[PDB]
Amino acid sequence: CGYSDRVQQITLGNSTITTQEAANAVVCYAEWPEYLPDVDASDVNKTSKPDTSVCRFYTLDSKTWTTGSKGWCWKLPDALKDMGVFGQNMFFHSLGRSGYTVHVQCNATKFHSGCLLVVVIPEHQLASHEGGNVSVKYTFTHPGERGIDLSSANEVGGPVKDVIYNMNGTLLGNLLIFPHQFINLRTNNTATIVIPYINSVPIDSMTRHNNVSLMVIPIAPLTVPTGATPSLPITVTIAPMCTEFSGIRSKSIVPQ
Amino acid sequence: INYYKDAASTSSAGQSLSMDPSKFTEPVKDLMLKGAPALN
Amino acid sequence: INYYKDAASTSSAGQSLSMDPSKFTEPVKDLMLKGAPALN
Amino acid sequence: INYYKDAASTSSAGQSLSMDPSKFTEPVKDLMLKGAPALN
Amino acid sequence: GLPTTTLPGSGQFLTTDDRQSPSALPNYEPTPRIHIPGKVHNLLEIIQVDTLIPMNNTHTKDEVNSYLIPLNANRQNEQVFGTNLFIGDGVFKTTLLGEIVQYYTHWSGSLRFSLMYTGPALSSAKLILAYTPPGARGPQDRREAMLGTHVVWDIGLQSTIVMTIPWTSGVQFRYTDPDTYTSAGFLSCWYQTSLILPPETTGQVYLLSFISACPDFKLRLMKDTQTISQTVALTE
Amino acid sequence: GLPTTTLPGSGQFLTTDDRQSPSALPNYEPTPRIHIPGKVHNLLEIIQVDTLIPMNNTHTKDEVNSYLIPLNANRQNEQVFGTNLFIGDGVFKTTLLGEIVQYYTHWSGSLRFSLMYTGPALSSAKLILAYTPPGARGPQDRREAMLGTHVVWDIGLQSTIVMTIPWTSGVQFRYTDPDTYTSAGFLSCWYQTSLILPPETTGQVYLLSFISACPDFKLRLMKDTQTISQTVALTE
Amino acid sequence: GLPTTTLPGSGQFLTTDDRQSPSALPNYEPTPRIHIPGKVHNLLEIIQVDTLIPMNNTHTKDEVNSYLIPLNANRQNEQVFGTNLFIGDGVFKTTLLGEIVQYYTHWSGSLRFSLMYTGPALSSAKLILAYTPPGARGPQDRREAMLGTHVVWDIGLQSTIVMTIPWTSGVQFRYTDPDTYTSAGFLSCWYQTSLILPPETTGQVYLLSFISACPDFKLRLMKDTQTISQTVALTE
Amino acid sequence: TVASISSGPKHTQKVPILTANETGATMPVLPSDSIETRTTYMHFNGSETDVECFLGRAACVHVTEIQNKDATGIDNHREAKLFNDWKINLSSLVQLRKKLELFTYVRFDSEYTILATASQPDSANYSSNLVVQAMYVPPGAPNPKEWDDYTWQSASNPSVFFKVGDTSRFSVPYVGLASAYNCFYDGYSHDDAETQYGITVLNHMGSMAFRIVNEHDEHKTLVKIRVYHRAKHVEAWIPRAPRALPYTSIGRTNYPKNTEPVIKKRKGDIKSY
RNA sequence: UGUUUUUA
Whether residue E11 lies within 8 A of chain G, CB to CB, comes out as: no
Instruction: Assign 3-state DSSP to chain F and report helix, strand, coil percentages, each to 5.
Output: 10, 35, 55
Looking at chain H from residue 202 to 231, which residues have their Cβ under 8 Å from any Cβ of chain F?
228, 230
CA H225 to chain centre: 17
Query: What number of residues does chain A have?
Result: 256
Indicate yes or no: strand I within 7 A of the C-beta of H9. Answer: yes
Beta carbons within 8 Å of H173's beta carbon, 6+ residues apart: B6, B7, B8, F23, F25, F28, F30, H109, H110
Beta carbons within 8 Å of F72's beta carbon, 6+ residues apart: F195, F204
Assess if residue A36 is contained within a domain: yes
d(CA D7, CA D16): 18
Chain D residues closer than 8 Å to G222 by CB: none
Chain E residues closer than 8 Å to G7 by CB: 1
- Positive or negative CA dihedral for H97, H103, H104, H110? negative
Task: State the CB neighbour count (10 A cutoff) for residue G17.
Answer: 12
For residue G96, the one-letter residue type is L
Pairing of strands A26-27, A190-195: parallel
Beta carbons within 8 Å of F226's beta carbon, 6+ residues apart: F102
Assess if residue A256 is contained within a domain: no
CB E37 within 8 Å of CB F40: no
d(CA E116, CA E149): 19
Whether residue H201 lies within 8 A of chain F, CB to CB, comes out as: no
Task: State the CB neighbour count (10 A cutoff) for residue A52.
Answer: 11
d(CA F116, CA F159): 5
Chain D residues closer than 8 Å to G26 by CB: 5-6
Indicate yes or no: strand I within 7 A of the C-beta of H6. Answer: yes
Indicate yes or no: strand I within 7 A of the C-beta of H129. Answer: no
The gap between A26 CA and I3 C1' (Å) is 37
CATH code assigned at A100: 2.60.120.20
- How many distinct structural domains can be found in chain E? 1
φ, ψ at F2 (rounded to 5°): -65, 120
Concatenated DSSP letters for chain A? ----SS-EEEEETTEEEEESSB---EEGGG----PPPTTT----SPPB--GGGTSS-EEEEEEEE-TT---EEEEETGGGTTSHHHHHHHHHEEEEEEEEEEEEE----TT-EEEEEEEEEET--PPBSS-TTPPPPHHHH---TT-EETTSPP-TTPBP--GGGTTTTB-GGGGGGSSEEEEETTT-SEEEEEEPP--SSSSB-TTTB-SEEEEEEEEEEEEPPTTS-S-EEEEEEEEEEEEEEEEE-SPPP---
Assign H224 to helix, strand or coil: strand
Looking at chain H from residue 53 to 82, which residues have their Cβ under 8 Å from any Cβ of chain G?
53, 57
CB B11 within 8 Å of CB F16: no
Q: What is the DSSP letter of H99?
A: H
Indicate yes or no: strand I within 7 A of the C-beta of H11. Answer: yes
CB E193 within 8 Å of CB E154: no
d(CA F136, CA G29): 31
Assign F214 to helix, strand or coil: coil
**What is the distance in angstroms between the Cα of F165 and the nearest Cα belonging to chain E?**
46
**How far, CA to CA in Å, does A7 sit from each of A4, A57, A117, F44, H19?**
6, 18, 21, 35, 18
Residue G5's Cβ-count burial label (10 Å; 0-12, 13-18, 19+) is exposed
d(CA H226, CA H202): 25
Range 23-52, chain H: CB under 7 Å to any strand I atom: 39
Beta carbons within 8 Å of H159's beta carbon, 6+ residues apart: E14, E15, E16, H133, H134, H135, H136, H152
CB F4 within 8 Å of CB G10: yes
**Closest C-alpha to H108, from H66, H56, H59, H34:** H56
CB A162 within 8 Å of CB A149: no
Beta carbons within 8 Å of F162's beta carbon, 6+ residues apart: F112, F113, F114, H16, H17, H18, H19, H27, H29, H33, H34
Q: What is the DSSP letter of F181?
A: T
Please, which positions of strand I sit below 7 A from a protein CB? 2, 4-6
Whether residue E103 lies within 8 A of chain H, CB to CB, comes out as: yes
| Sheet containing E79-84, strands listed edge to edge, beginning at the edge strand earlier in sequence | E79-84, E186-196, E124-132, E149-155
Write down the domain spans for chain C.
1-40
**How far, CA to CA in Å, does F13 sit from each of B39, G10, H61, H172, H228?**
57, 18, 15, 18, 10
- The resolution, in Å, is 2.6
Assess if residue A129 is contained within a domain: yes
CB H235 within 8 Å of CB H106: yes
Concatenated DSSP letters for G61-100? S--GGGGEEEE-BT--S-EEEEEE--TTSGGGTTSHHHHH
Element (H, E) at H132: strand H131-137
Element (H, E) at H168: strand H167-172
Query: What number of residues does chain F have?
Result: 236
- Positive or negative CA dihedral for B11, B17, B18, B21? positive
Helix spans in chain E (H)? 43-46, 96-101, 142-145
**Closest C-alpha to H85, from E182, F236, E104:** F236
User: Which residues is G150 bridged to in the sheet?
Assistant: G130
φ, ψ at F142 (rounded to 5°): -75, -45
Task: State the CB neighbour count (10 A cutoff) for residue G231.
Answer: 4
Chain G residues closer than 8 Å to C3 by CB: 1-3
d(CA F88, CA F100): 9
Chain B residues closer than 8 Å to F18 by CB: 11-12
> What is the span of the domain harbouring residue G23?
1-236
Element (H, E) at H226: strand H221-239
User: Angle G188-G190-G193 (CA atoms, 0-180°, nearest 5)?
Assistant: 160
For residue E2, the one-letter residue type is L
**Closest C-alpha to A170, from F55, F95, H61, F90:** F95
- How many distinct structural domains can be found in chain A? 1
d(CA G42, CA G218): 12
Interchain touch C–A (≥3 Cβ pairs closer than 8 Å): no
Rg (CA), chain B: 20
Element (H, E) at H53: helix H51-54
Element (H, E) at F100: helix F96-101
**What is the distance in angstroms between the Cα of B22 and the nearest Cα belonging to chain F?**
8
Q: What is the DSSP letter of D34?
A: T
CB neighbour burial string for B7-19, b if at least 16 within 10 angstroms, e if fewer: bbbbbbeebeeeb
d(CA H44, CA F216): 9
The gap between H35 CA and I5 C1' (Å) is 19
φ, ψ at A88 (rounded to 5°): -65, -50
d(CA F120, CA F205): 8
> What is the span of the domain harbouring residue A197?
8-248
Interchain touch D–A (≥3 Cβ pairs closer than 8 Å): no
d(CA A207, CA A81): 8
- Positive or negative CA dihedral for E9, E11, E14, E19? positive
CB H133 within 8 Å of CB H159: yes
Nearest CA in chain F to E12: F22
**Closest C-alpha to E131, from E90, E186, E76:** E186
Pairing of strands F2-6, E2-4: parallel
Concatenated DSSP letters for F41-56? SBHHHHTTS-EE----
User: Which residues is H18 bridged to in the sheet?
Assistant: F161
| Method used to obtain the model | cryo-EM
Given a contact as 3+ CB pairs under 8 Å, which chains touch H?
Answer: A, B, E, F, G
Element (H, E) at G208: strand G205-213
The gap between H7 CA and I4 C1' (Å) is 10
CA H101 to chain centre: 9
Residue E70's Cβ-count burial label (10 Å; 0-12, 13-18, 19+) is middle
Contact B23 A6 (CB under 8 A): no
Interchain touch E–G (≥3 Cβ pairs closer than 8 Å): yes
Beta carbons within 8 Å of E96's beta carbon, 6+ residues apart: E46, E47, E49, E51
d(CA E151, CA E129): 5
Indicate yes or no: strand I within 7 A of the C-beta of H8. Answer: yes
Element (H, E) at G143: helix G142-145
The gap between H193 CA and I6 C1' (Å) is 72
Element (H, E) at F196: strand F186-196
